[PDB]
Ligand code: HEC
């Protein structure tokens with residue numbers, strides 16, 4: 001029936017897909033969760049402690065991460081900390097399109113606890129249901145997220161009515177597996193949510209266009225980065241954007257579902273494409289599953305390598321802004337022209353580190369683009385470092401060859417008890433990166 005949210009009702013017509021839907025050390029890598037940066041990820045990517053201080057750090061919640069059930073306990077805490085209101089429910093309850101239509105601006109301004117109170121108790125933890133992807137009348141794919149994806153498709157110049165079944169096989173995932181921004185009012189309350197797809201087209205939602213959008217919208221300054229004092233925006237899991245940007249598998253005609261919901265019927269388990277002896281891959285690939293596993297590992301190791309290069313280069317710039325501010329506080333003049341150019345280049349580097357870092361395929365969704373973006377992040381950061389090293393030297397402050405990041409000073413009081421960055425550790429990259437923890 002129309003308006004039936006209960007997956008158990010849909011499960012009486014389609015028991016197989018209902019059965020898979022409710023179902024939920026590794027040699028593969030993962031990036032960071034943009035909305036839940038953990039102490040574990042800071043330990044893995046040490047530059048993140050300095051770059052993300054001011055965004056919020058938390059404990060790794062090692063619980064099942066499937067669509068069917070989503071507990072609200074940690075989402076309540078995070079929401080109330082950020083004053084995000086109902087925003088964090090947008091991609092995590094089939095009631096989100098209904099709540100936003102009925103509450104309007106109040107869905108974003110009303111505290112999380114009061115928005116969650118409106119959802120029936122029997123479905124408080126229902127995450128992503130059949131109604132979010134399927135039309136109940138004919139089981140064809142649909143866009144339940146009109147207020148987010150529907151609006152973002154208009155920005156791309158896409159006629160939603162002319163979308164093919166193949167396009168919907170990725171766009172149904174693009175309802176949530178994309179980057180978003182939260183516009184805020186003067187009282188730091190959330191006043192909306194949008195995908196920064198202005199200026200982009202289908203098959204080309206580039207980091208250049210996303211960054212240009214973020215930097216042009218003063219309302220999406222969601223936090224203050226502590227090391228620099230700069231008000232910045234943020235990027236979260238840009239999976240559809242990275243994948244669809246002319247990637248190898250996008251050009252090959254693969255959709256998200258070819259790897260994540262492969263046929264046998266379409267697998268409704270959100271299981272890893274690397275499991276079951278690479279069965280999702282073997283549908284196109286003639287190579288041994290071990291060869292395919294080794295290729296994913298080589299892509300992920302290459303991406304991690306570039307994440308550390310670009311991340312340590314970006315952290316070096318942020319640390320030099322901190323030295324430049326401390327010099328200004330002492331009455332030393334820092335050359336305005338050098339400083340402004342360095343800040344402009346620094347933001348270009350920072351958003352690129354977050355863009356690839358927050359995408360959890362660790363380069364696999366678009367290996368060539370992951371390389372281009374992280375290579376550009378290093379070029380932007382190294383040029384900002386050039387101008388800040390010069391500005392500091394002009395002001396009488398000599399920056400050594402190895403920059404002391406003092407990573408421990410960016411650990412919250414809770415994090416100091418869980419993690420320590422050895423001050424004697426020195427990163428000396430073959431390309432020029434030279435930092436000490
Ligand atoms: C919003 C309503 C979503 C739609 C539509 C799709 N996904 Fe999703 N997915 C969403 C969330 C909020 C989460 C996290 C759940 C949690 O436990 O907090 C997920 C998770 C996945 C995963 C697992 C990732 C992980 O952290 O291990 C995968 C592999 C995944 N989703 C794939 C996926 C695909 C292929 C989709 C389209 C058919 C799709 N999702 C749609 C939210 C939403």
Ligand code: HEC
Pocket residue numbers: 033035036061065075078079082084087088089090091175176177178179180193237359360
């Ligand atoms: C849609 C555009 C989303 C909004 C708005 C928010 N989240 Fe999210 N989240 C989304 C997806 C598709 C995924 C899984 C994919 C991936 O690569 O991780 C997630 C994941 C999380 C997680 C990690 C899973 C877990 O440990 O349970 C957390 C903790 C989480 N999301 C929190 C969170 C908060 C606090 C938000 C509000 C600011 C928020 N998310 C918004 C998609 C979307």
Ligand code: HEC
Pocket residue numbers: 007010011014017018021067128129130131132133134139141165169172173257261265266267268
């Ligand atoms: C989005 C993230 C989905 C959720 C949640 C559910 N389903 Fe699904 N389903 C999805 C896709 C992308 C596809 C492939 C469509 C295509 O173009 O072939 C499917 C397919 C089905 C089908 C028909 C084909 C098949 O595999 O048998 C049925 C009958 C079906 N799905 C049922 C179903 C039910 C009952 C769900 C909730 C409990 C459910 N789906 C959730 C994407 C998504």
Ligand code: HEC
Pocket residue numbers: 028030170173174177239240241243244249254255256257258259260272273274275296360361364365
């Ligand atoms: C095959 C060629 C793929 C296509 C097309 C897409 N994805 Fe993928 N993804 C793939 C692999 C091999 C991996 C590596 C890690 C693994 O979980 O096995 C991933 C990873 C993800 C994740 C992260 C999972 C986690 O545990 O956090 C998500 C959420 C995800 N992929 C989503 C996703 C979406 C929405 C896609 C379309 C835009 C998409 N993937 C395409 C393989 C392939």
Ligand code: HEC
Pocket residue numbers: 248249252253254258259273274278280281282283284285292293295296
């Ligand atoms: C078909 C629909 C595919 C699925 C599903 C998967 N892959 Fe794929 N892949 C596909 C094509 C057409 C190509 C282009 C190869 C060519 O002839 O140029 C690829 C390529 C890759 C590569 C790169 C190989 C290289 O020469 O460097 C890798 C490493 C790869 N694919 C891995 C892979 C994995 C692990 C998959 C499952 C999760 C997977 N692919 C699925 C088509 C399709």
